[PDB]
RNA sequence: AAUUUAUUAAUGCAAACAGUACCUAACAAACCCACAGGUCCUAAACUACCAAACCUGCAUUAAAAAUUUCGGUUGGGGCGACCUCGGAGCAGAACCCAACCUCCGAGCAGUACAUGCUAAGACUUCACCAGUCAAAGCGAACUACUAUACUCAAUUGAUCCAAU
RNA sequence: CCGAGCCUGGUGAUAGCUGGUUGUCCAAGAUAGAAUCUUAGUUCAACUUUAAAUUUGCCCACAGAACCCUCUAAAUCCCCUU
RNA sequence: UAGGGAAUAGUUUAAAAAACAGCUGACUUUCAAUCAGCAGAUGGAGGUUCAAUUCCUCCUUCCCUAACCA
């Protein structure tokens with residue numbers, strides 16, 4: 004019985020794996036596209052702020068907060 | 082009792098030989114001290130009557146302190162040995178059917194002692210016309226004195242009571258003992274009013 | 284002996300075989316989900332971090 | 340009379356330790372001897388007397404190696420002599 | 425699980441109880457545990473006491489229920505008021521409800537459903553500037569900002585989402601209140617619930633049905649099988665002592 | 677200094693040993709009732725205190741002691757400094773080579789997630805321990821990212837035992 | 841002979857430390873290192889001795905063994921023949 | 923490390939409020955105090971629900987308690 008249950012558990016878990024990989028692969032691509040978006044936006048906003056004031060916790064905090072609010076305001080509309 | 086065991090294994094001695102004890106076999110660990118165990122009750126057969134239990138021949142489980150320090154030394158109880166159980170069991174049969182008379186139960190003796198020294202305040206309302214009957218009077222034992230009396234046991238003075246006054250109720254406990262308690266018919270007062278009026282005031 | 288920047292974690296196979304391997308990851312980054320070869324089933328399967336072994 | 344390991348750890352010091360029984364003075368009545376005795380006992384003795392249904396049964400039933408008392412053996416000879424005579 | 429609250433729950437469970445009258449004809453109540461059980465006999469007995477203790481034939485049966493209103497998890501549930509009408513609502517007439525709705529079509533739905541007091545700012549201002557008494561309040565989300573003025577006045581009795589009294593659909597509590605009877609809660613939170621069930625003259629079967637309805641009504645707060653919700657039940661008339669009912673069969 | 681509280685004293689619990697007490701904040705708004713008070717709109721539920729010492733067991737805190745040790749290198753010892761690992765000179769060309777000799781470093785980080793499995797033949801820090809490189813094969817990868825024992829010089833810790 | 845008496849016993853205490861270790865004759869026989877509370881000692885190597893097995897040992901011709909950097913050193917390694 | 927618990931405005935508390943600080947001012951020689959205003963928050967992520975500080979889950983930080991032996 005123990006052997007039969009273990010093999011059944013593996014078989015069931017291994018029939019779902021093909022779909023799981025597809026979902027995982029997409030998440031990697033999505034993360035690659037999200038990092039690029041952050042890399043671009045954060046650098047521009049943070050860089051400009053630093054150059055103006057001080058040539059940086061306060062400014063970084065603000066931009067790191069207002070951007071979140073903009074996303075939330077869209078979620079509130081949903 | 083302190084129960085101990087050895088830390089070190091003792092080598093087998095074999096059949097008909099004494100174990101070889103090194104000085105390391107004197108190292109012990111305390112397994113248990115039996116004085117800290119939950120106390121068990123002692124089963125005794127009563128002889129005379131006691132407030133807690135008093136039916137002669139009743140198998141009672143009491144605290145070992147009570148049985149050893151009071152009941153057994155004075156003779157009020159005996160050990161629940163097979164021989165004693167047989168003797169008391171035989172006596173029970175004779176009481177049920179033989180000449181030996183029946184005796185009150187444990188509770189019966191407690192009630193009789195309470196009924197001997199108690200007065201019933203049969204609070205009756207003034208507005209509504211009331212006639213005192215065994216059923217109504219029985220209710221007041223439960224409320225006033227806390228005694229649960231069967232309606233049939235009560236024997237009223239047999240004179241219709243419709244006026245505040247004093248009378249007598251003859252209570253029969255289990256059919257053997259008849260107690261006559263003083264009866265005080267008084268104007269009914271609600272529990273809250275009576276307690277605030279007198280208990281709080283004085 | 285230095286600031287703990289990485290941690291050792293146990294990656295557990297999602298195939299139900301129970302095969303596990305230990306990998307090093309950054310403390311601040313998210314839990315790792317990796318595609319790693321599982322000998323029991325003899326093919327690459329998704330693994331998911333379950334516990335943190337120690338701090339490196 | 341024995342030894343113990345401190346904190347129940349064999350790697351710690353080995354210390355001398357004596358466990359003494361809790362002693363109580365109680366009064367017992369012997370039916371065969373019709374006399375009351377004030378004797379020092381332990382809670383175990385009281386339990387053994389209860390299991391025997393009295394002092395006389397305990398004294399008569401208990402072997403010498405279990406009584407472990409010269410006084411107890413004197414009571415046994417006293418009780419046995421009255422029964423024999 | 426605070427020691428006091430949990431210990432009492434253990435203690436109340438410990439109270440012994442017995443079936444049937446003892447063999448002894450006359451026995452002191454102290455010498456034996458509680459005995460009277462069956463719900464049918466209980467109602468019949470309460471009528472007997474009414475005759476012996478001369479009193480009104482119709483009396484309010486203030487059933488007190490020591491309902492385990494706690495210990496779902498080591499975190500304890502909270503006291504609420506699940507309002508549901510009994511199968512045979514007793515002759516008491518209660519129609520007191522205040523509805524806060526301003527410049528909304530709900531004003532009609534409020535009064536259409538039998539609202540006693542319906543109004544907006546004018547009603548809210550009246551509560552703050554002058555004394556007024558209502559049994560229960562309801563408000564739509566749009567009026568909650570304005571209604572916040574009466575939060576302090578009502579001392580937490582103002583509408584709250586926790587009691588399902590904030591919502592576009594008012595008839596949650598409004599409609600069912602008149603026929604429904606509120607399952608109020610203890611002030612000391614000792615878990616005893618004083619809830620009238622029926623008038624004394626109501627037939628035993630109808631009172632029995634009224635009892636069962638509350639059993640489901642009370643468990644509505646925590647109808648989980650994880651923690652037992654009922655311990656003891658005392659069915660008492662206005663001028664009589666409580667009787668320990670055998671509620672175990674009626675629990676599920 | 678590490679280890680310990682058996683011992684002594686104090687404290688707490690248990691053990692042992694008596695019983696003592698069982699709990700009161702209305703109010704009629706209406707109606708009844710000569711009063712005194714009642715009907716209605718609750719008159720429920722609920723036990724609480726609690727035995728002084730001595731002795732014994734188990735704990736906690738002190739006192740007073742007990743047992744044991746107090747590394748090495750070193751132009752004598754102490755003081756100072758040093759103690760493992762790697763690169764360079766001394767040691768010029770196979771290997772090896774010292775000084776409290778001369779210099780610079782290490783106690784990681786980063787990328788993979790087949791840094792999977794297995795197996796000829798070899799190297800080796802002068803022993804051992806440990807350490808090192810690997811064809812073929814299995815399974816992968818692959819359609820030319822100097823690709824299948826990652827980059828990196830050192831980047832490190834035996835046995836018992838413990839956790840799982 | 842009191843930094844804690846004396847006697848007997850455990851006791852032939854232990855001592856990597858010092859000293860001592862008994863007839864004759866012949867033979868082979870000197871010294872890389874590593875670790876170690878280890879450097880007044882040990883254990884493994886190395887050297888040394890005895891017995892056995894079977895096969896090369898030593899001496900060495902060419903050819904051959906790096907750039908970076910300054911003494912472009914005396915030499916070494918490898919190696920048939922002999 | 924182990925579980926338990928916790929995370930609210932710059933700060934400290936409450937069931938989305940008050941207090942202090944910042945205060946912009948007024949008034950005090952000065953400053954405090956005082957008065958009136960103004961800004962200010964639900965550790966992070968994901969999900970349920972029309973709506974989540976108030977349901978749940980994982981992670982970060984901290985506390986608690988117990989470890990931290992070999």
Ligand SMILES: [K+]
Nearest residue numbers: 750751752753
């Ligand atoms: K010198």
Ligand SMILES: [K+]
Nearest residue numbers: 856879880881
């Ligand atoms: K030495």
Ligand SMILES: [K+]
Nearest residue numbers: 857858859860
């Ligand atoms: K010498």
Ligand SMILES: [Mg+2]
Nearest residue numbers: 745746747877
């Ligand atoms: Mg040391």
Ligand SMILES: [Mg+2]
Nearest residue numbers: 748749750753
């Ligand atoms: Mg030295």
Ligand SMILES: [Mg+2]
Nearest residue numbers: 750751752753
């Ligand atoms: Mg020197």
Ligand SMILES: [Mg+2]
Nearest residue numbers: 754755756757
């Ligand atoms: Mg020094």
Ligand SMILES: [Mg+2]
Nearest residue numbers: 800801802803
């Ligand atoms: Mg070697």
Ligand SMILES: [Mg+2]
Nearest residue numbers: 811812813824
């Ligand atoms: Mg290959």
Ligand SMILES: [Mg+2]
Nearest residue numbers: 841842845846
């Ligand atoms: Mg002398």
Ligand SMILES: [Mg+2]
Nearest residue numbers: 852853854855
């Ligand atoms: Mg010697």
Ligand SMILES: [Mg+2]
Nearest residue numbers: 866867868869
């Ligand atoms: Mg020679």
Ligand SMILES: [Mg+2]
Nearest residue numbers: 747876877878
């Ligand atoms: Mg060492």
Ligand SMILES: [Mg+2]
Nearest residue numbers: 878879881882
């Ligand atoms: Mg040496």
Ligand SMILES: [Mg+2]
Nearest residue numbers: 898900919920
């Ligand atoms: Mg040659």
